[PDB]
């Protein structure tokens, strides 16, 4: 390695842009660095921002695990777009329709759960009757305090 192969400041002159494109091993027309807004990116190229799952899996890749070649410029977020991580594959259904359908499904069933909680179902019976003043001593009540007499009558 040597000094003039490491990344540097943002290129301004077209000659510096061509030198940076030759350093990063691609065409000058395809070399688009990050905009110099002062975020610290520098002269690193702005790759088309897609995951490694969208690459060709049948190609003889140098690194078939990551689907990457040798000497090709890596993405700034290559650790995010590996196959172990976030995928940007084209879905058969549009994103907005999927999100709206899922939110409507969840919201509708939550609303119907609340409505059913408002109006419960039961069976036409009275309360269950337990003996000995509704089991006052068996519910952990103190034996000194005599409970209020609850009497259940035959029906």
């Amino acid at each position: 390695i040597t000094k003039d192969m490491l990344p540097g400041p943002y290129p301004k002159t077209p000659e510096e842009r061509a030198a940076a494109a030759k350093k990063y091993n691609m065409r000058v027309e395809d070399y688009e660095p990050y905009p110099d807004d002062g975020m610290g990116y520098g002269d690193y190229p702005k790759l088309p921002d897609r995951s490694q799952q969208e690459r060709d899996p049948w190609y003889d890749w140098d690194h078939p695990d990551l689907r990457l070649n040798w000497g090709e410029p890596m993405h700034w977020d290559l650790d995010m777009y590996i196959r172990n991580r976030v995928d940007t594959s084209p879905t058969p259904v549009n994103w907005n329709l999927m999100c709206k359908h899922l939110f409507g499904f969840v919201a509708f069933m939550l609303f119907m759960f609340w409505v059913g909680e408002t109006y419960p179902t039961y069976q036409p019976v009275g309360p269950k009757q337990y003996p000995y003043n509704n089991l006052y001593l068996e519910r952990g009540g103190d034996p000194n305090k005599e409970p209020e007499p609850v009497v259940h009558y035959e029906i």
Partner: protein, 177 residues
């Protein structure tokens, strides 16, 4: 437009790949063989109707509308072969594909358990190290000015020599180690 030997996909390869993908998705859509055969004959009629179209931009527009038609009605979960990428058995045995050079690090006590195999391995290594300079000189005298244009490698054009860069492709681990 990502190919190992070529730089682009022509019209014919695009039509053939679209036909193959459409037939695979149609096979995924209808489970039974007779229904798939009937609808595959129907799709073959649909593709054969516009075979002899000499207008190039009309062929391009037919390709675009056929691609939109395929994207509109493809299966959400198409059938994938087990060894195909995205399959259930894809890259499963990569945990057993031990590279050959690990045999160079074996102890001499466990190297004596397979004498004849390691003798043949030594012969293979001698062949590779005696053909390496010849094949790299073959490569350096055949590559044009400005580097190679494609990734296609030249064959062995002489008698007694081997094709260049033959080691890591011949000695790759098997699919079932």
């Amino acid at each position: 437009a990502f190919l190992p030997s070529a730089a682009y996909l022509t019209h014919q390869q695009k039509v053939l790949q679209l036909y193959k993908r459409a037939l695979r998705h149609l096979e995924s859509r209808c489970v039974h063989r007779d229904k798939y055969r009937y609808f595959a004959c129907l799709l073959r009629a649909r593709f054969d109707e516009h075979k002899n179209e000499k207008d190039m931009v009309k062929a391009t527009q037919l390709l675009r509308e056929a691609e939109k038609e395929f994207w509109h009605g493809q299966h959400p979960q198409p059938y994938i072969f087990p060894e195909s990428p995205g399959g259930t058995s894809y890259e499963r045995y990569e945990c057993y594909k031990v590279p050959e050079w690990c045999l160079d690090d074996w102890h001499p006590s466990e190297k004596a358990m397979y004498p004849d195999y390691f003798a043949k391995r030594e012969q293979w290594k001698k062949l590779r190290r005696e053909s390496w300079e010849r094949e790299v000189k073959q490569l350096q005298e055949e590559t044009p000015v400005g580097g190679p244009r494609t990734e296609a490698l030249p064959p062995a054009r002489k008698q007694g020599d081997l094709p260049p860069l033959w080691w890591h492709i011949v000695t790759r681990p098997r699919e079932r180690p």
